[PDB]
């Protein structure tokens, strides 16, 4: 029931293959739905549910907004190149901003900026102030807080306009967000120097949250467990692996345990 909308902006001074001058991706609960880049110069969908937006002007309006960010971000990169007395070359400007809707119906909002892969400035939307990282960041923090309007305007977007759209996106995408795909699990192993390595692998589970671990006679072997990070598939599903080293003899003793919203009760798997 909690949800998020988040936009990821990336602007570079020197493009490279697969890295346009400016990219914007928007995600509904960590899944892409809208895309804009400086090459195509237009808003395109990344999800099919997007066909029900019914604003009519939506795609053209957001294209003009992206084209604005594209112009402005160029200017920001020049602002900061000169502010930090850097020379012309490869520089990176990134921004992430969006809203969350929590389990209790509460809202959060974010607007954080980075330059060269490091924190630059970020909005604290409840005090209407900014957290600057540098003396360079502070120049902007002063200009933004003296004028006194940018913080107010962003907080209004995150708390109203953003949430208002989130609720609609979540409704238009219910069949995608509310679906469930069970993991395909397989235990595999191989003997090294008298050490059996057990590998448990969950394939194509949706949604993202998952629990995986080894049990030796039903006792959790957490200290000796090597569990990977959740990684994406190309269809919107996820992948995870958990490994354990055992003694070749105590082999029957050991089971993999996968717990996931798609399975009414724990799945148990053995080599």
């Amino acid at each position: 029931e909690p949800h998020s909308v988040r936009y990821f902006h990336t602007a570079v001074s020197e493009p490279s293959p697969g890295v346009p001058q400016f990219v914007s991706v928007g995600y509904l609960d960590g899944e892409a739905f809208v895309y804009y880049d400086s090459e195509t110069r237009r808003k395109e969908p990344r999800a099919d549910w997007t066909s029900a937006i019914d604003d009519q002007q939506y795609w053209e309006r957001n294209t003009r907004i992206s084209q604005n960010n594209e112009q402005i971000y160029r200017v920001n990169l020049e602002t900061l190149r000169e502010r930090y007395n850097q020379s012309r070359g490869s520089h990176t400007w990134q921004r992430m901003y969006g809203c969350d809707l929590l389990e209790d119906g509460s809202v959060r909002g974010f607007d954080q900026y980075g330059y060269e892969g490091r924190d630059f400035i970020a909005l604290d939307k409840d005090t209407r102030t900014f957290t600057a990282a540098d003396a360079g960041a502070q120049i902007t923090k002063g200009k933004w807080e003296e004028e006194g309007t940018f913080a107010e305007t962003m907080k209004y977007y995150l708390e109203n306009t953003c949430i208002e759209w989130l609720r609609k996106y979540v409704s238009y995408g219910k069949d995608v967000l509310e679906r469930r795909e069970r993991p395909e699990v397989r235990v595999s192993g191989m003997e090294a120097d008298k050490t059996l390595t057990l590998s448990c692998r969950a394939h194509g589970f949706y949604p993202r949250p998952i629990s995986i671990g080894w049990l030796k006679d039903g006792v959790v072997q957490e200290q000796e467990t090597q569990r990977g990070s959740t990684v994406p598939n190309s269809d919107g599903t996820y992948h995870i692996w958990a490994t354990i080293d055992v003694l070749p003899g105590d082999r029957g003793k050991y089971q993999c345990r996968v717990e996931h919203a798609s399975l009414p009760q724990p799945g148990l798997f053995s080599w």
């Binding site: 907004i65 602002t79 962003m154 306009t161």
Partner: peptide, 9 residues
């Protein structure tokens, strides 16, 4: 929908 106001530093 993205925000209309531009962020200039």
């Amino acid at each position: 929908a993205e925000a209309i106001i531009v962020a200039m530093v």
